[PDB]
Ligand binder design. Structure first.
Ligand SMILES: [Zn+2]
Lengths: 199, 37, 280
């Protein structure tokens, strides 16, 4: 009853710090059956282990980088900066998104597909190379559409966030994309994105 | 009527502008009231 | 392959620096940002003639904080006014964090450099910029292939690029590994300096206004009493000087009080009598 007790005190130190938020350049896709996500220009598949399809079906979807243009040809890719350019890629369709999720600057290259043939050449993982392909870039309805023939149709649409940059004339840019270095399991990949414009 | 119709048009235009003003206010209030309270 | 010289400088105008400081403080504790306009005069010069702020966004300071509509319209209407300068670079404020570039800062700077190889990313600490020193730096980048190959980021041809030493705080946050500091020089012509001089240019009047004579007498009384105590201390200390071989000074304080007394009273006398004889 006659307790009347004193009291001690044990403090707990507390502190933390938000680091420099790290940009993860990750692409996601569910083209045929697998929710594959890859980090990356060295390529490494995060989830969606050894792909049921070949890598090439998705190698064409890979801001911050743009093709090399001469001084004669207006470089819509370049002057669209600092914001960059958002494109719609039709193969299966591909779109690039910039989001702020969590503490990672997400440069999504979100992939999606359908109409996978039961014996199509894209899933047996056979692959020789991608021969140099010329994209004819021209303006249809205020959107920079690039028509390219796939050799191993592409209906690329490029829109700048700065909707004031003048549209370049219809030219023919030669892309040469090939899977430089990889592994058999295709989990440690190095990609090539060389491409130069030609009038 | 005529001056009163002019007042009617004045007030409807100021409403038309103030609607988008409210929209902008809501936009920026969501911009600052984000989430991680 | 061409290499950026270490003698390259960023000539910030007076107006640009003032606008940058004002905007950086006005957003404390948030990090504000904006675009610096100017011109790349040559390979060794980047002139920042002006800088306009950008609306605050919940994103923070990122490549998504540059609203294309705002930037485009501001540039167009400034060009209408007479300022048709390209977007040289971008600036943002690190309040109390020192001057450096974080991962996202490096990211936005990569975005800007994609627009033009020469492009600076000056940052300003608005709360460390206490009167006197101004804490501000300007960094571009280092290409990863340049660094991994072992070649130095920037060719050197003079001592200009090394007159100032890098800070530890910047160095740990990636300085000389991913971005290099660019020397900053302030372009202040005579006209701007003379205009700024009016901030504390007293008047033509206070040169002729006498001190409140009662206040003057009270100040004289107080300082003379303090000087009396100091003289007592000085006498006491000097008496010790004799019985002490070479082995606060009541003298230095005494000299300071003497100087303040003579300046105050000489000024007051002269001002008073000039007043007596210029005003009838
Ligand atoms: Zn920053």
């Amino acid at each position: 009853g006659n307790l009347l007790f004193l009291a001690c005190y044990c403090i707990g130190g507390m502190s933390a710090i938000k680091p420099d938020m790290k940009i993860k350049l990750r692409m996601e896709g569910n083209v045929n059956g697998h929710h594959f996500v890859i980090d990356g220009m060295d390529l490494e598949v995060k989830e969606g282990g050894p792909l049921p399809f070949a890598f090439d079906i998705l190698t064409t979807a890979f801001n911050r980088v743009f093709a090399k243009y001469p001084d004669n040809i207006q470089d819509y890719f370049k002057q669209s900066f600092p914001k960059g350019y958002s494109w719609e890629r039709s193969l299966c369709n591909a779109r690039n998104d910039i989001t702020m999720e969590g503490d990672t600057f997400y440069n999504k290259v979100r992939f999606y597909g359908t109409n996978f043939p039961a014996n199509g050449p894209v899933m047996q993982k056979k692959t020789l190379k991608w021969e140099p392909s010329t994209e004819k870039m021209y303006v249809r309805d205020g959107v920079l559409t690039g028509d390219i023939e796939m050799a191993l149709d592409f209906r690329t649409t490029y829109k700048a966030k700065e909707k004031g940059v003048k549209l370049p004339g219809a030219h023919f840019v030669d892309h040469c994309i090939e899977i430089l270095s990889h592994d058999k399991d295709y989990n440690k990949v190095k990609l090539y994105e060389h491409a130069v414009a030609h009038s | 009527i005529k001056i009163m119709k002019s007042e009617v048009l004045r007030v409807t235009h100021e409403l038309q502008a103030m609607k988008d003003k409210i929209k902008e206010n809501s936009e920026k209030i969501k911009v600052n009231k984000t989430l991680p309270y | 392959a061409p290499a950026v010289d270490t003698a390259e400088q960023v000539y910030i105008s007076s107006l640009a620096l003032l606008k940058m400081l004002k905007h950086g403080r006005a957003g404390v504790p948030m990090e504000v940002m904006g675009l610096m306009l100017g011109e790349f005069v040559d390979d060794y010069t980047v002139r920042v003639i002006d800088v306009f702020a950008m609306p605050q966004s919940g994103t923070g300071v990122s490549v998504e904080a540059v609203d294309p509509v705002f930037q485009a319209k501001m540039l167009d209407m400034l060009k209408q006014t007479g300022r048709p300068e390209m977007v040289v670079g971008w600036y943002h404020s690190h309040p109390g964090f020192g001057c450096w570039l974080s991962g996202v800062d490096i990211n936005t700077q990569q975005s800007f450099e994609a627009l033009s190889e020469r492009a600076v990313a000056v940052v300003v600490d608005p709360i460390q910029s206490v009167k006197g020193k101004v804490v501000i730096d300007a960094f571009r980048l280092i290409n990863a292939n340049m660094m991994v190959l072992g070649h130095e980021p920037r060719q050197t041809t003079s001592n200009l690029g090394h007159l100032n030493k890098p800070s530890i705080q910047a160095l740990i946050h990636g300085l000389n590994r991913h971005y290099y500091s660019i020397t900053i020089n302030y372009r202040k012509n005579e006209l701007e300096q003379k205009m700024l001089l009016n901030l504390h240019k007293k008047s033509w009047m206070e040169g002729l206004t006498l001190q409140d004579y009662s206040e003057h007498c009270k100040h004289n009384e107080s300082v003379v009493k303090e000087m009396l105590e100091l003289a007592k201390n000085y006498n006491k200390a000097v008496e010790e000087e004799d019985k002490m071989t070479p082995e606060q000074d009541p003298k230095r304080h005494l000299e300071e009080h003497v100087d303040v007394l003579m300046t105050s009273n000489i000024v007051q006398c002269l001002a008073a009598m000039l007043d007596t004889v210029v005003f009838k």
